[PDB]
């Protein structure tokens, strides 16, 4: 039972 | 409830060519229905799809460690997940059920639509052919196309325009990666 | 040239405050994350026996997505989404035979935002016994699709409707299906 991996979402340019 | 809605979508698409030989990671940001910015592993950095996305594509391109992690994702993420899911996705095989029936109960010598129903199969790659008395009939074929049922099965309806006369034998021949020999079903006029 | 595509698809929607996280393979859902129970829901049972998935990460991604939706809402000068009404179709999974169990499929396609009300009607009355539904599935044009399912016993005496409400339709849409001899 191998595990699926995710890519992390990243915050946008708030400025 | 009429108040306005605002939508944000983030999609990571791993595209696989010839097994895992070629891999392309496509990260896409979408505001409402408009793609604003994307990372294409073939380019190796973010690119603004619309001007709305320019602030992000600039900001994110200034982060060298983010760009590195994304560039390597074709290995740590895409190829990893392909391997995790291969046995039951890429290699899923379900054999189609095939039936042949006249769309209408019409007596002979009158136009009829002969239906070849191919249901419950996976993957979606499939070839359906019609034969009248052993001769392939390429004309007058009317198809719903490939139908994805949403439950990891497909179906398709392939219809043949006929004027059935007595004695004629029509056969629907289905080729699918789940079968080593083509499936054949007959309807006798 | 393509052979396969895996998509990690996420969305967040305001002011509904609705989020979704799912994995897609060649158009079919592998799994999604139930936001409330905070847990992986496998599209097929056996998937959960062959693979696993840590939901915590998906929830963290969803939080970042909410923050980004608010930033982008401000940045766009509060541009709302244009409603796109769904196309609805009703089919059977297999050819209909009286007395042989079968399943009606309501395809809800090509719509946005991803909010719909879907009810099954038999002879005009709502049916909820044995029904099911998928979560929202991504599309290349960034609209959504959805499936509703109704197991049933074919008969000449019953009619069926899939009733779909969506903000893009000024009137509830009924898609009809019946066994006609």
Numbering used by the authors:
A (entry chain C): 1 to 15
B (entry chain B): 2 to 190
C (entry chain A): 2 to 182
Any passages from the paper?
nsp31350–1364 was identified as immunogenic in humanized HLA-DR1+ transgenic mice and elicited strong IFN-γ responses in individuals who were both SARS-CoV-2 experienced and HLA-DR1+ (27/30; 90%), as well as healthy donors with no known exposure (10/10; 100% deemed responders). As one of the highest-affinity binders for HLA-DR1 identified herein (IC50 = 140 nM) the structure of nsp31350–1364 was solved at 2.2 Å resolution in space group P 21 21 21 with two copies in the asymmetric unit. HLA-DR1 bound nsp31350–1364 via its predicted register (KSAFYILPSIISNEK). Placing P1-Phe and P4-Leu (most enriched in EL and BA motifs) and P6-Ser (enriched at P6) meant that nsp31350–1364 satisfied 3/4 positions within the HLA-DR1 binding motif. Incorporation of P9-Ser is deemed detrimental to HLA-DR1 binding. Thus, P9-Ser is likely the only shortcoming to nsp31350–1364 affinity when considering the core binding motif. Yet, nsp31350–1364 was still one of the highest-binding peptides, suggesting P9 may not be as important to HLA-DR1 binding affinity compared with other pockets (such as P1). In TCR-facing positions, nsp31350–1364 placed the large bulky Tyr residue at position P2 (P2-Tyr), forming a pi-pi stack between aromatic rings of P2-Tyr and His50β, resulting in a protruding surface at this TCR-facing position.
